[PDB]
Amino acid sequence: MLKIILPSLMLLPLTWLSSPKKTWTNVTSYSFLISLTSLTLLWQTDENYKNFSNMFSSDPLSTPLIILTAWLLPLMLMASQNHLKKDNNVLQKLYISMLISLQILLIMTFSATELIMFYILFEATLIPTLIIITRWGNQTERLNAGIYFLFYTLIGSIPLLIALILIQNHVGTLNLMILSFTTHTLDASWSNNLLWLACMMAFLIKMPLYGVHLWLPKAHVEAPIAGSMILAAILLKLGSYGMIRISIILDPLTKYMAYPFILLSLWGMIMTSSICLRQTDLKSLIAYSSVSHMALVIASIMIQTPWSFMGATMLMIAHGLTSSLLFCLANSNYERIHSRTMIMARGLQMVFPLMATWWLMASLANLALPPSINLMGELFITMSLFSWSNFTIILMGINIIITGMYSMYMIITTQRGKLTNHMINLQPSHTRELTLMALHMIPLILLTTSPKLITGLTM
Amino acid sequence: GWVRPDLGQLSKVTKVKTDRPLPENPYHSRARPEPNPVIEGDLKPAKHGTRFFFWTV
Ligand SMILES: CCCCCCCCCCCCO[C@@H]1O[C@H](CO)[C@@H](O[C@H]2O[C@H](CO)[C@@H](O)[C@H](O)[C@H]2O)[C@H](O)[C@H]1O
Ligand SMILES: CCCCCCCCCCCCO[C@@H]1O[C@H](CO)[C@@H](O[C@H]2O[C@H](CO)[C@@H](O)[C@H](O)[C@H]2O)[C@H](O)[C@H]1O
C-alpha cells in the first residue's frame, strides 16, 4: 500500500509548493493518477488476500472501500473549487491539505492489519473533519455540529479502546489474521455482554444506529460540500467496516446480543424514511436518507450470513456513490440561491434540462431501480433478513414504499411544476458541475456491469 | 624500681599474646540469605524489535 500512500503524501508538498494559479489543476490531476494506481489492488487472481507487510493488507472488503476513497479525493476538490474562489491563497491550500489528509488516513484505516492501528487512524479523521465543518461551514450552527460530531464519536470510542486493550492483554496481539485463526468461543457471562457492547457501540454510533444518529443530520446540514461528500460516502462506512472486522471475535454472543440493534435498525429505518417526507430542508432530506440506508447495513451485519454481508458491502459502495451525488446536486442549487429550503426553488427542469437528468438518475439509484447495485444490496439484505425471520418483510416492504415517495417527491418538488421565475440568478450549469455528476454516475453504471468487484468477503 | 610512663605511653595500642581461641561468630549471626542468581549471556537485539503494538521495528 506504500505505493498508494507515499504518492498521496506527496500531494501535500505539491499543494504548498505549487503556484497560486496551478494549485487546483496540479493537485486534481495527480489525485486522479493516484486513484488509478489503487486499481492494482483489484489484481486478485486467487483466494488469498493481499498481505503487503506487517502493517497493511488488502481484502475484498477493504479494496472497494480503499478505491472509493482514492477516487473521491479528486471529486471533492472539484466540488470545493467554486465556493472557495474568494479565499486567499493560503486558505485554499489549507483546505486542500485537510482534504488530502483525510484521504491518506482513510486509506491507512482500511488497509490496517491490526485493530489498535485501525482505532488510532479511525480517531485521527476527526481532526481534519472537525476543521472542515467548523472553519468552512456557513451557518452559526456549525459550532454545535462540530461538538455533536466530535463527542458522539469520542464517547463511543473510549469503551472500544478499553475493549481492544482487554483483547490484547488476553490474546497477546491485535492482528486481524491471528485473531481470526485463533478465535475462541466466548462465554455468555455478564462481563462478555459488556465486552460486546464495548466493541460495538463505537461502530454503531458512526453508522449511525437509530437513536444515536442526531449527529449526522447536524453535521451534514452545516458542512461544506466536500464535508458532506466524505461524511456520507466513507466516514459512515468506517462503522460498517469495523463491525465486520471485529465481529469475528465476538461469537456466539451476536446470536442474542444483536436483537436490540436489529430492532432499532428495522424500526429505526422506517422512522427515518418517513421523516424525509416532511423534511423542509433539501440537504436534511438526504442526510436522513443516509440514516435509513445504513439501517439495513447494520441489520444485515448483525445476522452474519453470506448473503447479508454481500448485500451490505454492495450497499456500502452503492450508497457511497449515490449519497455523494445527491449532496453535490443539492449543492449546485445552493451555490445559486444560497437557500437549502426544498420548496423555495421549483420547476428547475425548465432551465437546467441536463442537470435535471442527473437528478433523475441519482433519484432512481436512491430508490434502488434494478439492475443498479443499489437494488442488489437492498435485495440481498432482504433475502437474508427474510431467512433470519419472515416478518421482517413487513417492515422492509413499508420502507421500500416510503423510499419511493421521498425520492420522487424530491424530484417532483424541485425539478417540476412551474419555474420560480423570480430567480434571475439561475446561471447555466458549469462544465465543472456537470463533470462532477458524470464522475459519480459513470462508475456506478460500470460497477453494475461487473458486480463481482463489490461482493465482499463471503462472496 | 617503678618508672612512671611518659606522656603518651599509656594511650598506645599494644599487642597482647593469649592462648584463648579467636571467636569466629561473635554476633551469633545466621547464614546470610543467598543472592539472586545472575543471568549469563551476551546481549542480542530484542526479538522483533520493541514489540510495541503495531510498530514493526
Ligand atoms: C491530522 C490532520 C492535520 C491537522 C492540522 C491542523 C491544521 C491547523 C488547524 C487549525 C487552523 C489553523 O488556523 C488557520 O490559520 C491560518 C493561518 O495560520 C488562518 O489563515 C487566514 O488568516 C490569517 C490571518 O487571519 C492569514 O495569515 C492567512 O493568510 C489567512 O488565510 C486561518 O484563518 C486559520 O483558520
Ligand atoms: C450512547 C452514547 C451516545 C452519547 C452521546 C453523547 C453526546 C454528547 C454531546 C455533547 C453535547 C454538548 O451540547 C452542548 O450543549 C448544548 C446541547 O444542546 C448546545 O447548546 C445548544 O442548545 C442549548 C440548549 O440547552 C442552548 O443553550 C444553546 O444556545 C444551543 O447552542 C451546545 O452548543 C453544545 O455544545
Ligand SMILES: CCCCCCCCCCCCO[C@@H]1O[C@H](CO)[C@@H](O[C@H]2O[C@H](CO)[C@@H](O)[C@H](O)[C@H]2O)[C@H](O)[C@H]1O
Ligand atoms: C461504559 C463503559 C463500559 C466499559 C466496558 C469495558 C469492556 C468490558 C470488559 C469486560 C469486563 C471485564 O472483564 C474482566 O476481564 C478480566 C481479565 O481481563 C477477568 O476478571 C478477572 O481477571 C482475573 C482472571 O482472569 C482475576 O484474577 C481477577 O480477579 C478478575 O478481575 C474477567 O474476564 C472479567 O472480569
